Design a protein around this ligand. Structure first.
Ligand SMILES: CCCCCCCCCCCCCCCC
Ligand SMILES: CCCCCCCCCCCC
Ligand SMILES: CCCCCCCCCCCC
Ligand SMILES: CCCCCCCCCC
Ligand SMILES: CCCCCCCC
Ligand SMILES: CCCCCCCC
Ligand SMILES: CCCCCCCC
Ligand SMILES: [K+]
Ligand SMILES: [K+]
Ligand SMILES: [K+]
Ligand SMILES: [K+]
Ligand SMILES: [K+]
Ligand SMILES: [K+]
Lengths: 281, 268
């Protein structure tokens, strides 16, 4: 009873582990099947642009070119505009950017477009995160509570007008759809349409960014406050504000998918029992 | 009835404002020195090589700027590790999908893989939670019958979680990273924090800088991540409870003061 269920626990964990391993193997085989074709073509067309510049300029230091490229690669890790023209650059750590950077830290999005290179900044970031991450979780919980109860008001009016004859257990389906329906409008679609017309992104690049942002994965390959274009500055505030509330939306969405995985686990759990039982033994 | 959210919001805003002012105070000094020493290293290359001209350098820079979009990537092992960055929401970003299908798959792979990982991390966190429960049962006998009372023992037993934990999940993997990737002292601890906090800037990655590492190394990293995430998950939530107490202690301390201030105020 005390450590007898602990055996029933460890058997549950190991089985999850392998489902995750398989899922990482499946995802692996899919991604390289999707990216390796465009990898090689970019890998092979960059050696041609090497030989095109090695040979056309014999007087350049033929092998010290990679020495230069590595220094530009080292410059890439900083915020740079290394050009003949445009010798006055912009601050990547300005009064507004460091504010947005702190938002990447406590939310654990961490786009990485701007990362600290100072040993003091590194240590502060460590202390700023370890105390700021729990701080934000309480704000996100409070906002998630507000949205949870804001939606509770808006669904109360919707769960009475649909009360015809022969309607509670099958109304919980239609009311969770309007959460997704309205939800992916205000927190995915509408901010994606805005990003498309402000950052110049494509259709998918906007939705891809919203997902990567609000899933707090944050690759940083797309960031709303990365480039220099115009940035009204009525724009950088509403972004992290959107993030604050949008995170609360996916927090439910991801957890709803989680419960959808609970059921499908059980339903395949019993269906494997059905199948191994019957079918002419 | 009462909100209590708005008050937290402003504490977070001020914390983001203070953190902002600190970060640029820490980085903008080294921002200038690196931006001024790149302009010198650019004239150093125009002057030392009359071979290359003003117009031909900027053509090269834009090609490397075009290479920023790309840079063996996405091999049989790398895409496996990349999927680990997605479901754990670490997302180092050193390797990101450039294909329309890869982006769409990644969206679907995340929306369904993030909850999937949540249950595995919960199961491992359960094991560590009960593995540690065995380790403290022996610690809560041998010197607890002796002088100190047990409400004051809840202090010493939570220290051994932090003390022995930041050894196995921060220090020891950082010492290994220091001697395998050649990182410095802080760069190892900085990576462990950024990794296990799920922030994952990607400025340091155990799978990148690909010259020197073996096939006995890339498995153990994600394995360490799986268990180390469960460790910070508690650590961050414990710090959360520290704040939840300190809030309530300053909560009532302001009441104590606003009591006497207004209590004398009425008496005038
Ligand atoms: C233009 C981008 C659209 C991307 C939308 C992705 C929607 C996901 C649909 C996946 C359908 C599979 C359902 C399997 C149920 C477990
Ligand atoms: C010898 C260099 C060791 C660097 C370790 C600094 C870590 C600071 C963490 C602060 C936590 C309170
Ligand atoms: C009146 C309620 C204010 C809540 C106080 C929380 C502030 C915690 C600061 C911790 C700094 C290390
Ligand atoms: C009462 C409903 C408030 C909805 C706010 C919508 C926020 C959109 C953020 C972009
Ligand atoms: C969620 C689908 C997982 C497929 C593996 C099934 C093993 C019983
Ligand atoms: C970072 C410390 C903030 C303290 C705020 C106290 C508000 C009563
Ligand atoms: C390992 C460092 C913990 C220090 C805690 C300080 C609490 C006042
Ligand atoms: K992240
Ligand atoms: K990142
Ligand atoms: K990230
Ligand atoms: K990068
Ligand atoms: K995260
Ligand atoms: K997290």
């Amino acid at each position: 009873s005390d450590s007898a269920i602990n055996v029933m626990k460890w058997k549950t964990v190991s089985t999850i582990f392998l489902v995750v391993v398989l899922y990482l193997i499946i995802g692996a085989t899919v991604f390289k099947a999707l990216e390796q074709p465009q990898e090689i073509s970019q890998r092979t067309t960059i050696v041609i642009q090497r030989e095109k510049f090695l040979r056309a300029h014999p007087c350049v230091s033929d092998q010290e070119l990679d020495e230069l490229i590595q220094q530009i690669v080292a410059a890439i890790n900083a915020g740079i505009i290394p050009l003949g023209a445009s010798s006055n650059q912009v601050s990547h750590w300005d009064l507004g950017s460091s504010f947005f950077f702190a938002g990447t830290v406590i939310t654990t999005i961490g786009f990485g477009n701007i990362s600290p290179r100072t040993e003091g900044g590194k240590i502060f970031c460590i202390i700023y995160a370890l105390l700021g991450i729990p701080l934000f979780g309480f704000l996100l919980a409070g906002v998630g509570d507000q949205l949870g109860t804001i939606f509770g008001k808006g669904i109360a009016k919707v769960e009475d007008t649909f009360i015809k004859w022969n309607v509670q257990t099958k109304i919980r389906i239609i009311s969770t759809i309007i959460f997704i329906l309205f939800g992916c409008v205000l927190f995915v679609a509408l901010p994606a349409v805005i990003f498309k017309h402000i950052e110049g992104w494509s259709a998918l690049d906007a939705i891809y960014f919203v997902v990567i942002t609000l899933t707090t994965i944050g690759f940083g390959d797309y960031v709303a406050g990365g480039s220099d274009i115009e940035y009204l500055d009525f724009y950088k505030p509403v972004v992290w504000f959107w993030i604050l509330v949008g995170l609360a939306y996916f927090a439910a969405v991801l957890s709803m998918i989680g419960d959808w995985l609970r059921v499908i686990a059980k339903k395949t759990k019993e269906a494997v029992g059905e199948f191994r039982a019957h079918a002419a033994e």
